[PDB]
Design a protein around this ligand. Structure first.
Ligand SMILES: *[C@@H]1O[C@H](CO)[C@@H](O)[C@H](O)[C@H]1NC(C)=O
Ligand SMILES: *[C@@H]1O[C@H](CO)[C@@H](O)[C@H](O)[C@H]1NC(C)=O
Lengths: 104, 104
């Protein structure tokens, strides 16, 4: 239940992009989820600011929430599609995949 | 109630650091909080991955949570303190202050 990376496959059919994409038919997108509380194991990649916020939360929970589990690194995907003039084009979409998460 | 930056002053006395710090007596730390849902106004600095995750959440909420509001930029502070041999030293602590937030 601690902050970590999870699996998530995204199908272009579910989003309604199947019409003009030639390949791939979907991709492994992943997602960050879980608690950012003590112990802030090093693997959880907390910043100094997160350590401070988690301590403040411990001292008076009304003053500030716990940090949130979020992506610390992302990578692009490339898709092959047909434009409106029937051209076949390769398009790069940046920040589409989660590679690592942390309490930031 | 949307994702934005908030005020948070942190006093070294509340954390028990007053013993050896010469200056300052605390600092403006800030914190990110709020919802990451449509509309993802541009000011909310969402990544492509967050847009995709928010859409997936809209299509079946059981599959994935909404993105979380987290810091996108942080700055260091410098403190003046007395070490165990009574030396006066200037120490820099990185990633201590939140400057901007987003749905990441
Ligand atoms: C924290 O970052 C490192 C990158 O060195 C990564 O390998 C690790 O998986 C990250 N932790 C989590 C929980 O995603
Ligand atoms: C999003 O990032 C920009 C930096 O260009 C920043 O000025 C803005 O305040 C950020 N938004 C929020 C809600 O913090």
């Amino acid at each position: 239940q601690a902050c970590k990376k999870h699996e998530l496959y995204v199908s272009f059919r579910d989003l309604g992009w199947q019409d003009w994409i030639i390949a791939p038919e979907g991709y492994a997108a992943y997602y960050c989820e879980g608690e950012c509380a003590f112990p802030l194991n090093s693997y959880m990649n907390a910043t100094n600011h997160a350590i401070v916020q988690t301590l403040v939360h411990f001292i008076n929970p009304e003053t500030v929430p716990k940090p949130c589990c979020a992506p610390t690194q992302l990578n692009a995907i490339s898709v092959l599609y047909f434009d409106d003039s029937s051209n076949v084009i390769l398009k790069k979409y940046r920040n589409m995949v989660v590679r690592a998460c942390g309490c930031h």
